[PDB]
Structure formats: structure tokens, C-alpha cells
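Cross-posted from the bioinformatics board.
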Amino acid sequence: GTETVPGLGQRKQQILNSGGGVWDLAIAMLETKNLGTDYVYGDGKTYDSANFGIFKQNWFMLRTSTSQFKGQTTNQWNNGAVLNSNLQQDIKARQESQNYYGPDKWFAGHRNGESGLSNPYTQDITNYKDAVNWIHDQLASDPKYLSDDTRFWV
Amino acid sequence: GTETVPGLGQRKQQILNSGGGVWDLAIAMLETKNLGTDYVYGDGKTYDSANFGIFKQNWFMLRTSTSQFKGQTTNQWNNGAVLNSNLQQDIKARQESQNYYGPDKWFAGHRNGESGLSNPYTQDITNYKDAVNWIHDQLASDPKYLSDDTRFWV
């Protein structure tokens, strides 16, 4: 459905002004209500499972597929927390990660980490991918949704 | 299958050093044998159908979904020819186009233009997507394929 979140429109514009596209906005919109990074640290997870930034990218993905973190170890997972305060780096990391894995494998590793890359096409990953695509379709339907306070949720 | 193409490794590394990811390399690899732009001008097409750059992006997609050509008209289609000699702009245009439409719609509009956006899941579009994914899998199977002269063709 849809809900109105006061001030969300300014944050959408900040994401688009910081290198994000509509597709990035759709992913972030699914992950948090406020397009924010103020969920609990690591979204409560640690090491390769820890989540950072507006997309809740996991550390496994960051350390294997971004210019900023490639080659870093599982033990260095707290390094990902800089994405909670640097929106430009957060967006660039997700785009690089998707351009490394391609969209199908990026979805799988984003959702199921390393085990997801072993088969991107299970139903659980499909459900997440379908939800992002529905949200993108809504955002792409009218330019007003790129700057108003409308949130599409699944 | 596979084939060896002299000079291909140089073009692979230029793509990966000019903003492109392995995902971009897979798409370009499907579109031309030499990762080049020296097919006939527009690939023999004109106006919204004309193709430019190493991905053979069409002018309809360029004018509707990139920052460089945003808002331009069908009649301005020769403006896309700059992509035939500016690889950085070529790659950035394709990545922006995909972030605007999302991967599934980008594939559909890349393959079938504006009408593809209305029917994005035809067998032909699916076949094209599956070809890119297979090619990406082959590139990703050994780091040497990112700099050697091996082409994977479908």
C-alpha cells in the first residue's frame, strides 16, 4: 500500500541528488520507512551478516564487490558503519555491488548473503525482487512521487 | 560458445577502467564482437531506433532516461553519436538508463524500444536477458577472462 511520511520527499531528493536513481530509491524505500540509517546498529547482526546504510547492504556483499571495501575481512565488519553517515558512499557502494554481480545475483546476495549467490532463483529471493519491482513501478508512474511524501510499502 | 578475438582484452580493461562493471562488460560482449562502436552508423537505423555506443543503446532510451540527453527530441537523434567515441559517457548513460527504468524495463526498452516498455517479458526479451546472464557467469568464472582475449558468444 501507500502511506504519507512527513519530510520523506526532501530525503528522496537528497538520495537522487547524491548519485541515486529511481531504482536505488525503490530498494531503500522497501528497507526502511524513513529512507534512513538510524535502525539499530548492524540491524542487530554482526560480521558478514551485519547491515549498513539505507539499503541494509550486508558486510559480505560490501567486502566482496565494492571499491570501498573489497578485500577487507569478515573481522573488519565494523568498517561498513561509515555508510551510515556517508550517503554518497552508500549509494556508490550499492551501485558498484550490483554492477559487479549483476541484478539477479545482487538480489540473491543482498537477501541471503553468500549462500544466496549459490542459486539466485529461489522463491524467497523472487519475493523480495518482485517487491522492489512493484515499488519501482509505482515511483516511475508519476514524477510527483520522486519529491512528495508518499511511501509505497510491501 | 567461446572464441578468441585479438585486442579484446584491451577493450575489456578500458570498459572496467571507465566506470563499467563486469555486468556492463557482459552486455557489450553480447552486442558486438570487438567491444567497439564501428558498426554501421546508427546500426542502420534512424530517429528513436538509432543505436549508439558499445551497447547499441537506442535513441529513445537515451533521450528518456539519461542525464546527458534528458528531454531531447526524436529529431535530435544524431546527438547520440558522441557515444561512439566517448566510452565514459557511453557507460554512464547505460547505467543511468538502467537505474531510471529498472533492470527488467531497461532490458525491454533496450531490446524493443518504447513498445518493449509495454510488454517487458516476451520470449525474445527473456532470451536476451538469459544470454547476458550466461555471458556474465562465464566472465565471472575466472578473473583471467576480465583481461584476456576470450569472447563468450550466444
